[model samples]
Target: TGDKPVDLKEITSGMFYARSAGRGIRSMPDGEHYTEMNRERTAIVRYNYASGKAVDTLFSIERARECPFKQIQNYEVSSTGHHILLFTDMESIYRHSYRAAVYDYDVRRNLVKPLSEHVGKVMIPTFSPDGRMVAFVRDNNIFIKKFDFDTEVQVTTDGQINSVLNGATDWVYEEEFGVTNLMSWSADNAFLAFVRSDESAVPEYRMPMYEDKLYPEDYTYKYPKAGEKNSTVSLHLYNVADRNTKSVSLPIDADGYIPRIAFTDNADELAVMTLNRLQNDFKMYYVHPKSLVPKLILQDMNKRYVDSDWIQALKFTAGGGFAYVSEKDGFAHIYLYDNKGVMHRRITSGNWDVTKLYGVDASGTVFYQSAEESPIRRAVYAIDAKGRKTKLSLNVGTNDALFSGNYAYYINTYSSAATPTVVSVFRSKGAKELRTLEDNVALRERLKAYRYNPKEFTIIKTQSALELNAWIVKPIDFDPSRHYPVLMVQYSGPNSQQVLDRYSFDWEHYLASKGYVVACVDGRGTGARGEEWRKCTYMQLGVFESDDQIAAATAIGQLPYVDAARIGIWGWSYGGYTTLMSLCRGNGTFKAGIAVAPVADWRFYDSVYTERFMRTPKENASGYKMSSALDVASQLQGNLLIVSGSADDNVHLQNTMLFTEALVQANIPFDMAIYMDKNHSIYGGNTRYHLYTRKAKFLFDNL
Candidate 1:
């Protein structure tokens, strides 16, 4: 796969930009269909797959009636495909949850109506299968509103502040499980299933939320520390017609969690996935709501907690079989089973894991994206019910697809480390090229003026028998004779994989253009490899992650073109914590580093993510304190640059402030950049560019 160049200026945060000549392509609800927002940003126009022409205007400002919003931030087509929900004025409540005033635009009526009548916005409003009733969570409770009556009913009245949570998930569940709304509608919409998180066992971690207007108010929430007791989670099924809800009678451990609830093909059957406190064991059960009896279907036990990825991509076939991805065989593959939990067959067998399962077509052709061909490269393939597998993409690089509802056509978006994103429509059978959505040719051409070569990826075997995937980029026109400074980037969070065969046109690549050797290593505790690999650092989060990264740096430093003395490390969030750890406990392997929005201590982080890995501070007090960046700040000898956003509630600014105080007390000289009113991502107008530019300049001057 050859690299397609993309202009940095043309890049957007989301897959929103779509054009005829190929700058960006966005896949629509219909898999085969795709559209791009025009330069005017007036509307998203559908592009014909075969004609290479503008097919029709799916949405336009001119056609909008009673639509006060000028531009749609995001739009979702209802399951019936009769209505479009346009969202505008989005406000973030937490890391994942947000409240947005949604407008329901009826395609047939050409009318737009507010989904919620209340003045305040709602979070994760989901329409029932019939699209007649909409359920949403507000103030931590579930509410259902009928479209016909314009009537509202509170389903779970027992929901109270930090006590009985109904549809909305708590901090830990949202942060670690990666889900905010816990509500799930059954196939018939006759019943609604939600997780009630009881956080009474969790301790409260308080941080003074500063409001300098007049008198400041302190924000308090029950935050479970490492090893601290977490919320006792239980599943509740709500009978919509009768307006009664009851807890599912599952024999789960009191301390365990109900992570997900899925509706099976059978209206009476509901799938429940639960995990033990340590997250090492997973139990999946199929329950009949009327009988209140759960049939244990599958059990996946890991040396460590199961990968959260499994929570996603668990698909039930309409015919009877269900597909699951598992790393039990030391590699992730598809496992097929009968509807009754009896193992039928293994659909995939390979050393590499299946990264994503795209959807299956009516013909039983299972479409998926995987790294089986190459870890750095991703391609789409189709496997028929007869067990025949065929690659559908012709163009190389990273081939991602947007399949139509019927799987008749697919939009292929291809990109690579050097290539920008190029999107094209293609028949699912790989017969013909339809239309070019975005080539990103201009961005590629613009990149030629930059001073860096494309990133080179490789796997390095550490002395400790750890093989880590890494990517490196050097200064343009580099000479092997002269040793170059190295800056290692990492995000060592569990279930997070950074090394891939994808485009790396971000700040790291830009830094490489400025005469630095930028490198990234997905060390121990990184995801994609499986549960054991991701949870190796179980009790000690940053301990092994930093050690492996240091080992990678040690190996890279041995290169004749690398200056071992000039080696540095940097990361954000968990990676940021790793950066601090590397500089301290890394045994002088790095001379400088940057920690952005890092967690100083596990006790400071949310209960869900923190407790899952380390249990509780009471149970793992020594381990918690030892992994804390604050405790190791005194050992810091590197030229450290601690950066964080003032409003980083995820990894509170306190992480940086506490560690900064420690560094200052120890008289450690370092620089810090605090973005005002920025969140954990620190993204805003020119914020990313400015942040990267500042970091680049710092590394250029220091490293």
Candidate 2:
């Protein structure tokens, strides 16, 4: 092809894009293929991976029968790949829970079957591995039916509101632990194991929801604050062949949590991951199904709680071995172990961290993504069974890949601060470029005339000896003699890294274009540094995180072109939390700041996530008191602006409310804006643009 023709699909922020060379592109399983409901969205099309030709519609709106809905939110392909479960009418219940109606569409039969009784919302309906059964949770209980069975059977009869939960986690587990679906099928389809949560012991936290009722309705849920009791959770396995249920009793502390369960090579062995209440220690157990006995497989102990972010990197090898990632040596590396949990050798060893593990190929080569060269840049690597690692990606800039199922080929998506996305297909082993998938050279060429200079990715070492990744953008034609105002952006949360060697195509550039030096710093608590680097924020979430960020800002202020007196800071969500802490920590680094959707107090955030780090506020009141940005609102020296969405269900406007009142009680003056109907993302028709414009205008005028 002269130039790879582009079938541009509509792009959304914070959505995962999966492109298969010429085989077209899709978002994640959720918004993968577009449907008529999202006709405003570009339709998901089928394309030939080899020829780079648009074949046909993978999902056709006209083919849908009796489809009252207009758009499809997400679709899941069945195990056999003959049918797909179409999801629609998704209504958010909480952080991880959503209600949706599902329809089973058979590709071979060209038929559609409604799975849900009515259009009422449901959560996480998935087909069994054998495609013989379907399971879903509704009203806190799990329901299932064989593909041939007409009536659905309730698996657990003990399910009640907050008291008993079957096949689905509670609010704290969902919001903080990032768990929603509790049911998982064994590979052989013989058993289904799930967590039953008894949150009756946990305290009930109430929020008065504004409703059409004459009086405000109290939304009640079991919320485990610091020092509060967590839900008494247990794991149960049900055998489908015998209709017998057994409890998998693994040794767990009274305050520990069973975070994850997975089926190993032998379907009888289930891998369960548990963490202490303090989130500083983790134990992985391989449980024998018949005996119901758990054998300790791996122990990951950290001074701080190990986050579930590394769980995705766990992959079982076909040769009866598994891969492990540990930051025990002050850096992260991959280790290979046998089924017995005996570490034979390390597959990867270096100062850098492996960010993501794609999977193992037929040749037993482990493929992964890591920032081995520079903390600001990411690249793909393949390690062989002999423990030799090879860098497969040639791109020096940020390189990400989508490998073929067999690992013979990969589609490399490369980008830089100055370059748009240029995707190309290559041999997985040799990384020989077979063909170009996309060269957004036109976009790059068009950006040349823009008034902004390219962002420079750099590593800034703090006084505490912690290395931080950062990016800085200056004026188009910068004069070093003239001082320029500086604006710092940071999201200093554990497992959240904002500093990356990638194209700064949007909002940051927009700010840079308006005559401000924009910079972003990934401090101590940020991700990709593995458990050690990330867990530094544990127990003291905002303490050291703010320390490193302030150091970066102070160091940047030393630049001849940067005016230290005219420094401002801003962030959203956890970043927003840090922004407030940075301003009030008496650093005198930020002259002004904007914090959107910030957690003013550790107590205000959800139980699972918050408690893991700080424990119960009752037990660690000092820690909670220390991390609270609300406590020091009076100490805020900058021109602070707090923004939030009143309808934000995630961070909850409580954060902003509490912090605003603190400022008021402290006799401090600050600016605030709360969109009446905005969520955590704060995105809608021009809503984000308006918010950013407001922020940019504030920084431009005030700073």
Candidate 3:
């Protein structure tokens, strides 16, 4: 069979982008069945998960009565399964936040009606546990809609964007906290708990966006940079019957962050979690819905900083407790806690970190994903009350599980460097494989036609004497006798992994097919490794990570098949920042480097993320200077190419401009490209393709 060389045009123009078919299979409340949308997304089909047979159509534009939309972007069924929230015409607001025209579909009647009486879109439409009512955020305010009376009442009225946010989080909160909606209903459906974030004090960041218009328009949003003022957040509990709301008087610092608020299995216990400015002190409080009194439950004060994500993953179990993840034991492990905030038992403990906690079932069996196998891989395991652990995953790659409601079955998705994603259903008891949901067989077959080889994973020993997880890609016609220019790629963010055992056929393959070697190193500050390894770059963000990447690249340069003189590196966002750090300190180790939307200094980034790692730039001035590429801008090496999305609200174009200014003062000439109106992810229509081509062409010419 004749194989085609991996075309850069095809690679950039969505050949590899849309390789896998999304299952969109959501497990039903019943452990035996699951619901999924049809290929056309015109119908929501219910299926018997075990046998892979369609039970019936839950919602269909074809047969649905009074369903007034083309198709739904997403749909969520209520706990009682009698009501469904259908999201349509969804538009992205920021990174994680979205507004949609929501419709309520009555399952039994097959009737649909708009969630809001008005034509305006709503955000984060949520259903009550009993399924009679729905609550959503509209125009930054929370509203409740009762299906019984067809009544829509506003829970909050003073909701303004960039000022007083009632239910939806601010820009920084959405980006760093990984949260969108701040409103959550109590378990009994009698009360609603939400956060009111007043971001008026926060400074505004604006970007001049060009829409190919005669005049450029400015898009502005509240963005709190490091050491800047954050939103003053307050918690509110609204009673459905009395139609009254009370603000809780919690004992927290004025600058504290209310990351999450939810009702536990106990309806009265509203779980409120807060983090201090440095995020080192984490406190979980249980507030009574009626009394509105906050009671401190669990507190984890760490020496460095606490992972808000770990607190966000707090899974309240059925037996009056929650499954929590803590790095107190030198590793992130699951610890079961009672209602009194006392430790019941540590579910899984070892040097290995538990990446995710699924939940604890009725029998006290805790299901989780962990790096017990290896830091580069993942596996699902179930730990019983007696501490007997059973491995549920059959594959050795990155395995993830979405357990059913009753824990009788779980949807297991497995992938590796050599394999595309294979999603299957498994009987959770004995880890019995049931049926394959999606194997991406077509994508797998399609890949054989391209001139490619399996990504080879290996351990690289850096000059720091640290063994780093790394992967390399070679040309289809790779020869050991011939040396090839190498492109070292990396994203060395804290608790972020680049070299993993997941199926990924990205630009590296295209570069390899173009007769270049592509390699990625998971250096210090990357995740899956314990706290000591991941947090070693604390107080000084890019110093150690860039050192590891440089050393790793140096080690690769010594390879007989790799050309030392023509080695280059490139990355996006944090990866881009690391690229600058590596180049500025590379000492000609990297012959060329590309940084896309790189942060030149820690002071330019947001507060939560920046402070969590490097504290405040003022608090740790020397650390910031040591870690900043801007401080060492005059010591630039390598052929530098800077790419920036002009409207990037995350890293901002200010970062690239600052470095360019410094470089100009130092008499260093470099290449620069700015995509007007593009955000952090510089993509829309031909924009992404153009960026990729520019990168590839730069590497081709420079290296």
Best by lDDT: 3
TM-score of 3: 0.98
When 1 and 3 are scored with TM-score, the better candidate is 3
Tens-digit lDDT track of model 3 for 611-671 = 9998887799899889889889898988999999989999989999999999999999899
Off by over 4 Å in 3: 17-23
**Any runs in candidate 1 off by more than 4 Å, and if so which?**
1-61, 161-164, 199-212, 215-222, 431-433, 459-467, 528-533, 618-628, 665-667, 685-690
Q: Estimate the overall C-alpha local distance difference test score of candidate 1.
A: 0.76
User: How large an RMSD does model 2 have?
Assistant: 5.1
The lDDT of model 2 is 0.74
Q: What is the lDDT of residue 332 in candidate 1?
A: 73
Predicted candidate 2 versus true structure: per-residue lDDT over 433-528, tens digit per residue: 877867765665555544456678777777667667788878545788988888888888877778877765556655665567888888877776
Per-candidate count of clashing residue pairs (backbone under 3 Å): 21, 9, 0
How far residue 503's Cα lies from its native spot in candidate 3, in Å, is 0.4
Tens-digit per-residue lDDT, 275-364, candidate 1: 887777888898888777999888888765567667656777775557787778777777777778987777777677687777666777
Question: Given candidate 3, what's the lDDT at residue 185?
Answer: 89
Which candidate achieves the best TM-score against the true structure? 3
